[PDB]
Amino acid sequence: FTVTVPKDLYVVEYGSNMTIECKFPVEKQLDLAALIVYWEMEDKNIIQFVHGEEDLKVQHSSYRQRARLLKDQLSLGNAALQITDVKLQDAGVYRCMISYGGADYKRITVKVNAPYNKINQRILVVDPVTSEHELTCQAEGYPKAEVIWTSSDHQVLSGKTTTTNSKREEKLFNVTSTLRINTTTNEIFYCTFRRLDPEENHTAELVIPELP
């Protein structure tokens, strides 16, 4: 008898839902009476499954509707912990304990990523006589990122970027950047949010519009 794990290191996304899993030997039928399932992180109880029911009375109160176990996976020999609305505090080492005619446990480490993938954009036509436009891209994440502006044939362009702490989540950063350039309907430009260690890129395409 041994509790098994498909992977001991997960990297999940900020604000998303996540599923960690522990597998254990199930010879045909499930006898729910013999079954203990237990999950915790950093000493706090996330889930306790006994007599085939979730024991919500004991769930550390910094959960509530955050955490549940996928009841259907059990019959399969899969204790599957789902957590909704992933916060940065959720990163750390988790433990799953399982008793079912033998006992064992496992440890899974969880990393939370806050990428710059929700990019808000806007174009302002500043002066149509000269065709000068102002392009702005902004997004929040961690850690601090630069913005690189490029033309459709990939020349790096000269911008202005402003970094502050986010007002929504305090641990995140806010990054806006502005490019000022003379240009015409249907031209394409790229703003790329880049962070390092390890390198990660997210970029929006901006199309110069035609206004009356």
Side-chain angles (χ1 to χ4, degrees):
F1 184 86
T2 69
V3 159
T4 222
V5 108
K7 173 217 257 261
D8 64 12
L9 172 63
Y10 295 73
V11 184
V12 300
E13 181 157 337
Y14 180 75
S16 185
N17 320 41
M18 71 155 150
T19 300
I20 59 186
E21 51 200 36
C22 284
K23 304 196 186 192
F24 60 100
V26 175
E27 298 200 53
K28 290 185 305 181
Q29 280 45 97
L30 193 61
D31 201 354
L32 289 171
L35 179 69
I36 305 284
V37 181
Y38 190 100
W39 285 96
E40 68 156 74
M41 149 173 72
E42 327 255 306
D43 294 3
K44 312 159 291 187
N45 169 255
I46 300 151
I47 271 285
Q48 184 174 67
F49 198 75
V50 297
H51 289 135
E53 273 207 278
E54 279 186 330
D55 197 281
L56 293 179
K57 292 289 288 175
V58 156
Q59 183 184 62
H60 184 256
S61 5
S62 83
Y63 299 80
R64 277 268 127 155
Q65 321 255 108
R66 299 212 60 213
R68 80 157 177 157
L69 186 71
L70 273 148
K71 269 78 45 48
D72 54 334
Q73 297 289 120
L74 255 348
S75 325
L76 288 184
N78 200 200
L81 173 55
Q82 217 195 58
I83 298 181
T84 74
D85 179 50
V86 170
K87 296 221 82 108
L88 212 172
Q89 289 86 24
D90 289 313
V93 211
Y94 288 63
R95 182 170 179 271
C96 77
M97 204 204 103
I98 292 169
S99 162
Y100 184 57
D104 198 24
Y105 78 72
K106 274 288 169 300
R107 285 160 80 83
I108 293 157
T109 152
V110 171
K111 287 226 285 162
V112 178
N113 182 19
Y116 293 89
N117 53 1
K118 304 147 67 83
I119 300 163
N120 303 304
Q121 61 182 86
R122 50 176 263 251
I123 302 160
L124 168 57
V125 21
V126 178
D127 190 2
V129 165
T130 176
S131 220
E132 188 194 23
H133 290 67
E134 180 173 293
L135 337 199
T136 305
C137 279
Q138 81 83 219
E140 313 203 331
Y142 182 97
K144 299 155 143 147
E146 59 171 278
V147 180
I148 302 176
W149 289 92
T150 47
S151 63
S152 61
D153 59 13
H154 316 292
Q155 303 285 6
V156 169
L157 297 172
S158 188
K160 175 160 189 167
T161 137
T162 308
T163 300
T164 58
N165 285 304
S166 166
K167 287 169 272 201
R168 310 204 203 83
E169 181 89 81
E170 30 154 305
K171 327 206 192 300
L172 303 194
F173 301 107
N174 192 88
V175 170
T176 349
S177 185
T178 287
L179 201 225
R180 296 174 138 277
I181 189 150
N182 295 337
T183 201
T184 48
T185 289
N186 275 348
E187 310 219 10
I188 287 154
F189 300 88
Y190 304 108
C191 68
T192 289
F193 284 74
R194 174 178 290 174
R195 88 192 236 8
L196 308 169
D197 298 347
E199 186 172 325
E200 178 177 13
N201 294 292
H202 297 273
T203 111
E205 205 192 59
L206 297 71
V207 176
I208 308 305
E210 186 188 46
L211 308 160

PDB file of all heavy atoms in Angstrom, residues 43-47 55-67:
ATOM      1  N   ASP A  43       0.055  23.495   8.352  1.00  0.00           N
ATOM      2  CA  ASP A  43      -0.606  23.170   9.629  1.00  0.00           C
ATOM      3  C   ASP A  43      -2.138  23.409   9.720  1.00  0.00           C
ATOM      4  O   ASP A  43      -2.808  22.921  10.650  1.00  0.00           O
ATOM      5  CB  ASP A  43       0.170  23.776  10.822  1.00  0.00           C
ATOM      6  CG  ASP A  43       1.576  23.151  10.998  1.00  0.00           C
ATOM      7  OD1 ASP A  43       1.966  22.290  10.173  1.00  0.00           O
ATOM      8  OD2 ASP A  43       2.299  23.509  11.962  1.00  0.00           O
ATOM      9  N   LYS A  44      -2.686  24.120   8.736  1.00  0.00           N
ATOM     10  CA  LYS A  44      -4.117  24.452   8.693  1.00  0.00           C
ATOM     11  C   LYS A  44      -4.903  23.380   7.932  1.00  0.00           C
ATOM     12  O   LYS A  44      -4.456  22.909   6.889  1.00  0.00           O
ATOM     13  CB  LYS A  44      -4.334  25.829   8.038  1.00  0.00           C
ATOM     14  CG  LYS A  44      -3.424  26.947   8.572  1.00  0.00           C
ATOM     15  CD  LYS A  44      -3.288  28.129   7.583  1.00  0.00           C
ATOM     16  CE  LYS A  44      -2.505  27.749   6.322  1.00  0.00           C
ATOM     17  NZ  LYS A  44      -2.234  28.925   5.448  1.00  0.00           N
ATOM     18  N   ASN A  45      -6.076  23.006   8.438  1.00  0.00           N
ATOM     19  CA  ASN A  45      -6.845  21.959   7.771  1.00  0.00           C
ATOM     20  C   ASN A  45      -7.704  22.440   6.611  1.00  0.00           C
ATOM     21  O   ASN A  45      -8.583  23.281   6.783  1.00  0.00           O
ATOM     22  CB  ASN A  45      -7.728  21.180   8.736  1.00  0.00           C
ATOM     23  CG  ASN A  45      -8.710  20.281   7.995  1.00  0.00           C
ATOM     24  OD1 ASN A  45      -9.910  20.578   7.915  1.00  0.00           O
ATOM     25  ND2 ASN A  45      -8.192  19.198   7.402  1.00  0.00           N
ATOM     26  N   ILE A  46      -7.468  21.880   5.436  1.00  0.00           N
ATOM     27  CA  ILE A  46      -8.239  22.261   4.267  1.00  0.00           C
ATOM     28  C   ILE A  46      -9.453  21.349   4.116  1.00  0.00           C
ATOM     29  O   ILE A  46     -10.563  21.832   3.884  1.00  0.00           O
ATOM     30  CB  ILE A  46      -7.380  22.254   2.991  1.00  0.00           C
ATOM     31  CG1 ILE A  46      -6.215  23.248   3.118  1.00  0.00           C
ATOM     32  CG2 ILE A  46      -8.219  22.573   1.765  1.00  0.00           C
ATOM     33  CD1 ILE A  46      -4.995  22.857   2.309  1.00  0.00           C
ATOM     34  N   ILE A  47      -9.252  20.034   4.274  1.00  0.00           N
ATOM     35  CA  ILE A  47     -10.316  19.056   4.006  1.00  0.00           C
ATOM     36  C   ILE A  47     -10.140  17.788   4.824  1.00  0.00           C
ATOM     37  O   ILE A  47      -9.023  17.312   4.997  1.00  0.00           O
ATOM     38  CB  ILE A  47     -10.397  18.718   2.481  1.00  0.00           C
ATOM     39  CG1 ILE A  47     -11.349  19.676   1.748  1.00  0.00           C
ATOM     40  CG2 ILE A  47     -10.812  17.266   2.235  1.00  0.00           C
ATOM     41  CD1 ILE A  47     -12.825  19.399   1.986  1.00  0.00           C
ATOM     42  N   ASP A  55     -16.189  16.992   6.162  1.00  0.00           N
ATOM     43  CA  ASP A  55     -16.325  17.432   7.549  1.00  0.00           C
ATOM     44  C   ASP A  55     -16.023  18.934   7.703  1.00  0.00           C
ATOM     45  O   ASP A  55     -14.984  19.332   8.253  1.00  0.00           O
ATOM     46  CB  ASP A  55     -15.436  16.571   8.452  1.00  0.00           C
ATOM     47  CG  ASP A  55     -15.817  16.671   9.911  1.00  0.00           C
ATOM     48  OD1 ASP A  55     -15.427  17.673  10.544  1.00  0.00           O
ATOM     49  OD2 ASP A  55     -16.495  15.748  10.427  1.00  0.00           O
ATOM     50  N   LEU A  56     -16.954  19.763   7.224  1.00  0.00           N
ATOM     51  CA  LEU A  56     -16.734  21.214   7.112  1.00  0.00           C
ATOM     52  C   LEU A  56     -16.550  21.937   8.450  1.00  0.00           C
ATOM     53  O   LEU A  56     -15.949  23.012   8.501  1.00  0.00           O
ATOM     54  CB  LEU A  56     -17.818  21.884   6.242  1.00  0.00           C
ATOM     55  CG  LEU A  56     -17.855  21.548   4.735  1.00  0.00           C
ATOM     56  CD1 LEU A  56     -18.990  22.278   4.019  1.00  0.00           C
ATOM     57  CD2 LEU A  56     -16.535  21.828   4.038  1.00  0.00           C
ATOM     58  N   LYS A  57     -17.051  21.337   9.525  1.00  0.00           N
ATOM     59  CA  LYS A  57     -16.878  21.865  10.879  1.00  0.00           C
ATOM     60  C   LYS A  57     -15.405  22.141  11.232  1.00  0.00           C
ATOM     61  O   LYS A  57     -15.105  23.106  11.938  1.00  0.00           O
ATOM     62  CB  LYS A  57     -17.491  20.903  11.910  1.00  0.00           C
ATOM     63  CG  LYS A  57     -19.028  20.780  11.880  1.00  0.00           C
ATOM     64  CD  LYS A  57     -19.728  22.044  12.406  1.00  0.00           C
ATOM     65  CE  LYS A  57     -19.578  22.191  13.922  1.00  0.00           C
ATOM     66  NZ  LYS A  57     -20.142  23.477  14.434  1.00  0.00           N
ATOM     67  N   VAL A  58     -14.501  21.303  10.725  1.00  0.00           N
ATOM     68  CA  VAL A  58     -13.073  21.362  11.077  1.00  0.00           C
ATOM     69  C   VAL A  58     -12.183  22.128  10.079  1.00  0.00           C
ATOM     70  O   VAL A  58     -11.006  22.371  10.358  1.00  0.00           O
ATOM     71  CB  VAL A  58     -12.512  19.931  11.322  1.00  0.00           C
ATOM     72  CG1 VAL A  58     -10.988  19.870  11.114  1.00  0.00           C
ATOM     73  CG2 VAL A  58     -12.898  19.440  12.719  1.00  0.00           C
ATOM     74  N   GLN A  59     -12.740  22.505   8.930  1.00  0.00           N
ATOM     75  CA  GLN A  59     -11.998  23.209   7.889  1.00  0.00           C
ATOM     76  C   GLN A  59     -11.532  24.569   8.404  1.00  0.00           C
ATOM     77  O   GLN A  59     -12.351  25.404   8.798  1.00  0.00           O
ATOM     78  CB  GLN A  59     -12.888  23.377   6.657  1.00  0.00           C
ATOM     79  CG  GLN A  59     -12.235  24.027   5.435  1.00  0.00           C
ATOM     80  CD  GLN A  59     -13.227  24.235   4.284  1.00  0.00           C
ATOM     81  OE1 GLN A  59     -14.219  24.968   4.418  1.00  0.00           O
ATOM     82  NE2 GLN A  59     -12.960  23.590   3.150  1.00  0.00           N
ATOM     83  N   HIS A  60     -10.217  24.785   8.417  1.00  0.00           N
ATOM     84  CA  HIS A  60      -9.663  26.068   8.838  1.00  0.00           C
ATOM     85  C   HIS A  60     -10.489  27.195   8.211  1.00  0.00           C
ATOM     86  O   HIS A  60     -10.752  27.178   6.995  1.00  0.00           O
ATOM     87  CB  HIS A  60      -8.181  26.190   8.452  1.00  0.00           C
ATOM     88  CG  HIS A  60      -7.530  27.450   8.940  1.00  0.00           C
ATOM     89  ND1 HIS A  60      -7.259  28.522   8.110  1.00  0.00           N
ATOM     90  CD2 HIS A  60      -7.120  27.820  10.178  1.00  0.00           C
ATOM     91  CE1 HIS A  60      -6.700  29.490   8.816  1.00  0.00           C
ATOM     92  NE2 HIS A  60      -6.605  29.090  10.073  1.00  0.00           N
ATOM     93  N   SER A  61     -10.905  28.155   9.041  1.00  0.00           N
ATOM     94  CA  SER A  61     -11.845  29.196   8.591  1.00  0.00           C
ATOM     95  C   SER A  61     -11.352  30.127   7.473  1.00  0.00           C
ATOM     96  O   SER A  61     -12.168  30.768   6.817  1.00  0.00           O
ATOM     97  CB  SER A  61     -12.476  29.976   9.764  1.00  0.00           C
ATOM     98  OG  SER A  61     -11.942  29.595  11.023  1.00  0.00           O
ATOM     99  N   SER A  62     -10.043  30.177   7.223  1.00  0.00           N
ATOM    100  CA  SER A  62      -9.526  30.931   6.074  1.00  0.00           C
ATOM    101  C   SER A  62      -9.803  30.203   4.750  1.00  0.00           C
ATOM    102  O   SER A  62      -9.152  30.473   3.717  1.00  0.00           O
ATOM    103  CB  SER A  62      -8.033  31.260   6.227  1.00  0.00           C
ATOM    104  OG  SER A  62      -7.213  30.169   5.829  1.00  0.00           O
ATOM    105  N   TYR A  63     -10.749  29.257   4.795  1.00  0.00           N
ATOM    106  CA  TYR A  63     -11.327  28.675   3.572  1.00  0.00           C
ATOM    107  C   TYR A  63     -12.817  29.081   3.385  1.00  0.00           C
ATOM    108  O   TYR A  63     -13.102  30.209   2.933  1.00  0.00           O
ATOM    109  CB  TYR A  63     -10.980  27.176   3.408  1.00  0.00           C
ATOM    110  CG  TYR A  63      -9.463  27.014   3.321  1.00  0.00           C
ATOM    111  CD1 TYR A  63      -8.674  27.027   4.479  1.00  0.00           C
ATOM    112  CD2 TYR A  63      -8.806  26.931   2.089  1.00  0.00           C
ATOM    113  CE1 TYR A  63      -7.270  26.940   4.417  1.00  0.00           C
ATOM    114  CE2 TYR A  63      -7.397  26.851   2.013  1.00  0.00           C
ATOM    115  CZ  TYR A  63      -6.636  26.861   3.189  1.00  0.00           C
ATOM    116  OH  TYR A  63      -5.248  26.788   3.160  1.00  0.00           O
ATOM    117  N   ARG A  64     -13.758  28.229   3.768  1.00  0.00           N
ATOM    118  CA  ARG A  64     -15.125  28.396   3.290  1.00  0.00           C
ATOM    119  C   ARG A  64     -15.104  28.102   1.791  1.00  0.00           C
ATOM    120  O   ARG A  64     -14.150  27.481   1.307  1.00  0.00           O
ATOM    121  CB  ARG A  64     -15.655  29.799   3.596  1.00  0.00           C
ATOM    122  CG  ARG A  64     -16.196  29.951   5.018  1.00  0.00           C
ATOM    123  CD  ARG A  64     -17.694  29.653   5.071  1.00  0.00           C
ATOM    124  NE  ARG A  64     -18.023  28.649   6.084  1.00  0.00           N
ATOM    125  CZ  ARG A  64     -19.209  28.539   6.679  1.00  0.00           C
ATOM    126  NH1 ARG A  64     -20.191  29.383   6.378  1.00  0.00           N
ATOM    127  NH2 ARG A  64     -19.411  27.593   7.589  1.00  0.00           N
ATOM    128  N   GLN A  65     -16.120  28.552   1.063  1.00  0.00           N
ATOM    129  CA  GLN A  65     -16.390  28.113  -0.321  1.00  0.00           C
ATOM    130  C   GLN A  65     -15.187  28.085  -1.287  1.00  0.00           C
ATOM    131  O   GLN A  65     -15.351  27.839  -2.484  1.00  0.00           O
ATOM    132  CB  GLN A  65     -17.528  28.939  -0.937  1.00  0.00           C
ATOM    133  CG  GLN A  65     -18.682  29.275   0.011  1.00  0.00           C
ATOM    134  CD  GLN A  65     -19.926  28.459  -0.254  1.00  0.00           C
ATOM    135  OE1 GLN A  65     -20.268  27.561   0.522  1.00  0.00           O
ATOM    136  NE2 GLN A  65     -20.613  28.767  -1.357  1.00  0.00           N
ATOM    137  N   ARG A  66     -13.991  28.332  -0.759  1.00  0.00           N
ATOM    138  CA  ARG A  66     -12.733  28.144  -1.492  1.00  0.00           C
ATOM    139  C   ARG A  66     -12.478  26.678  -1.862  1.00  0.00           C
ATOM    140  O   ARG A  66     -12.174  26.364  -3.020  1.00  0.00           O
ATOM    141  CB  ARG A  66     -11.555  28.651  -0.657  1.00  0.00           C
ATOM    142  CG  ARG A  66     -11.603  30.128  -0.295  1.00  0.00           C
ATOM    143  CD  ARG A  66     -10.194  30.700  -0.195  1.00  0.00           C
ATOM    144  NE  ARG A  66      -9.478  30.556  -1.465  1.00  0.00           N
ATOM    145  CZ  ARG A  66      -8.170  30.359  -1.585  1.00  0.00           C
ATOM    146  NH1 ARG A  66      -7.394  30.290  -0.515  1.00  0.00           N
ATOM    147  NH2 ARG A  66      -7.640  30.218  -2.790  1.00  0.00           N
ATOM    148  N   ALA A  67     -12.610  25.785  -0.879  1.00  0.00           N
ATOM    149  CA  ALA A  67     -12.122  24.399  -1.039  1.00  0.00           C
ATOM    150  C   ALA A  67     -13.158  23.264  -0.983  1.00  0.00           C
ATOM    151  O   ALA A  67     -14.013  23.217  -0.102  1.00  0.00           O
ATOM    152  CB  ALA A  67     -10.959  24.126  -0.056  1.00  0.00           C
TER     153      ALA A  67
END
